[PDB]
Amino acid sequence: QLPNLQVALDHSNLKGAITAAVSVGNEVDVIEAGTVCLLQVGSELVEVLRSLFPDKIIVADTKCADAGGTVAKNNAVRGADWMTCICSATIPTMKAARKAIEDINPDKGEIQVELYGDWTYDQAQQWLDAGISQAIYHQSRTWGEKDLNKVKKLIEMGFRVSVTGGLSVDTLKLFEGVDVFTFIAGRGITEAKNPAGAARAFKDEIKRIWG
Amino acid sequence: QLPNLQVALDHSNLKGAITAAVSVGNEVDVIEAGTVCLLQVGSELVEVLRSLFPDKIIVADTKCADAGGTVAKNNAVRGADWMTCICSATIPTMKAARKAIEDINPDKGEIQVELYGDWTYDQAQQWLDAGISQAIYHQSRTWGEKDLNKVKKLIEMGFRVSVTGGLSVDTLKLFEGVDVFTFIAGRGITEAKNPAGAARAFKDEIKRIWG
Ligand SMILES: [Mg+2]
Ligand SMILES: [Mg+2]
């Protein structure tokens, strides 16, 4: 399995998210409704994306902090495979979300932990023990040793790690030799002259490095 | 100023949130679109609530973790006065959100920090220095000394503190002598036989204790 290419749809309206998704959909592995977009338009976007892409992985990036079973159910019934919980969510909250998405989506339903602020590696092990083994790591605000070592360490622990922030066809090589699960890209690709060509070039660079 | 009564609308659909809001609106001080509801229906709810309640305080509970300026702008243009950021949001994120909501809503625009997981008092002081002085404290999963002391301490620091979780007309007295800014109630009130009567009894108990 090569690293996945994920497109983040972080648009402030429905037409922007749908247009971007359709423009790049055939060239990516994972299509994500980003939190900015969901807060604007609600979960019907998820259902529209599922209908357009029956076999693709679909992410509802809700960054759930509470009401885990409810939010997870609301998005799984729309067709999501993966849902994010914010790292400050409690273990009971994340477990409720995991159980609800697995209940509706036994084949692919998973929670991903969104990594923000001062999280710890003991916390991270608690996520693993809760049955949750995906985490989303963000570039500090290019990909220095401090960030890559945290990524490598999360990988050693047993996480499938997604990385996001400052990703381009040109910076992918910085991750050579690291077993990154998914690279999340956004406007770098969807705002390109040729979005599908940009998505393709990006995945072709993943092929060159990991293939 | 007495402690405010805030109703949380945490419904999984638009009709539930609107019906609950209308049922209790005249009896409460603050009407909140809860995160569960916003993830379902999007920010048009905020605009509907603003139109129904022109002079009321309106909360968009987005628990923003990132894209602070964008999310804050998206909800302020709909009419929100207060927006929540999750405590794991960075200081640059919270400052971007604060600046954007103040930009559209100079009279009442504020950020509130939603308190989840292992936050610290140094973090809390960083929020104050960032110009943010509201925090939402949740009952641990009735109102023992450990929780009340954290509340009292946040108040001593300079925060207007909202409390939520396990609030009833019967438990309000547990907070006697503490300068709570807002009590957030939810289904205890909106699911009552007489929602407006329940909202009224709750506020009447606030009057009795703080009046
Ligand atoms: Mg995302
Ligand atoms: Mg809330």
CATH of the domain at B174: 3.20.20.70
Whether residues B12 and A86 touch (CB distance < 8 A) is answered with no
Q: Kindly report the nearest CA distance between residue B207 and chain A, in angstroms.
A: 30
Chain B residue numbers with beta carbons less than 8 Å from the beta carbon of A36 are 67, 70-71, 74
Question: Residue B38 and residue A67: Cα distance in Å, rounded?
Answer: 13
Number of domains in chain A: 1
Q: Using an 8 Å Cβ cutoff, are B39 and A62 in contact? A: yes
Amino acid found at A26: N
Nearest residue to B76 via CA among B52, B53, B107: B107
Question: Residue A191 and residue A169: Cα distance in Å, rounded?
Answer: 14
Q: Using an 8 Å Cβ cutoff, are B57 and B108 in contact? A: yes
A187 labeled binding residue: yes
Question: Residue A121 and residue A146: Cα distance in Å, rounded?
Answer: 15
Residues of each annotated binding site of B for D-ribulose 5-phosphate:
63, 166, 186-187
Question: Residue A161 and residue A152: Cα distance in Å, rounded?
Answer: 9
By three-state DSSP, how is residue B184 classified? strand
Question: Residue B82 and residue B44: Cα distance in Å, rounded?
Answer: 16
Structure-block tokens of residue A134: 């995906």
Greatest extent of chain A over all pairs of C-alpha atoms, in Å: 45
E strand or H helix at B114: strand B110-114
Structure-block tokens of residue B91: 């200081």
Task: Return the residue in B11, B32, B66, B138 with the most chain A beta carbons within 10 A, the one to mutate for interface testing.
Answer: B66
Q: Using an 8 Å Cβ cutoff, are B138 and B165 in contact? A: yes
Question: Residue A187 and residue A203: Cα distance in Å, rounded?
Answer: 15
CB atoms within 10 A of CB B96: 23
Question: Residue B190 and residue A100: Cα distance in Å, rounded?
Answer: 26
Greatest extent of chain B over all pairs of C-alpha atoms, in Å: 45
CB atoms within 10 A of CB A10: 23
> Is the Cα torsion angle B36, A139, A94, A182 positive or negative in sign?
positive
Containing domain of residue A9, as a range?
A: 1-211
Q: How many residues does chain A have?
A: 211
Q: Using an 8 Å Cβ cutoff, are B33 and B14 in contact? A: no
Q: How many residues does chain B have?
A: 211
Question: Residue B104 and residue B72: Cα distance in Å, rounded?
Answer: 9
E strand or H helix at B178: none
Ligand 2 midpoint to CA A44 (Å): 22
Nearest residue to A155 via CA among A177, A170, A139: A177
Tell me the CA distances in angstroms from A173 to A28, A127, A142, A163, A206, one per residue in order. 19, 29, 12, 13, 9
Radius of gyration of chain B (CA): 16
Structure-block tokens of residue A39: 């807060």
Of A38, A87, A116, the CB nearest to B39: A38
Residues of B with CB under 8 A from a CB of A: 10, 12, 35-36, 38-43, 62-63, 65-67, 70-71, 74-75, 86-90, 92, 114, 116-119, 123, 141
According to DSSP H, which parts of chain A are helical? Answer: 14-24, 35-41, 44-52, 68-76, 91-104, 121-129, 145-157, 187-190, 195-210
Bridge partners, residue B138, by sequence: B164
Backbone angles phi, psi at A201, to 5 degrees: -60, -40
Give the method of determination.
X-ray
Give chain A's count of helices (H) and strands (E).
9, 8
> Could you tell me the resolution of this structure in angstroms?
2.0
**Burial call A162-172: b when 16+ CB within 10 Å, e when fewer:** bbbbebebebb
Q: Using an 8 Å Cβ cutoff, are B84 and B114 in contact? A: yes
A61 labeled binding residue: yes
Chain A residue numbers with beta carbons less than 8 Å from the beta carbon of B135 are none
Give chain B's count of helices (H) and strands (E).
9, 8
CA A60 to chain centre: 8
Whether residues B74 and A12 touch (CB distance < 8 A) is answered with yes
CB atoms within 10 A of CB B198: 21
Chain B residue numbers with beta carbons less than 8 Å from the beta carbon of A13 are none
Structure-block tokens of residue B83: 């927006």
Ligand 1 midpoint to CA A9 (Å): 8
Whether residues A116 and B89 touch (CB distance < 8 A) is answered with yes
Nearest residue to B148 via CA among B113, B117, B184, B173: B173
Tell me the CA distances in angstroms from A101 to A40, A54, A107, B190, one per residue in order. 22, 17, 10, 28
Q: Kindly report the nearest CA distance between residue B100 and chain A, in angstroms.
A: 15
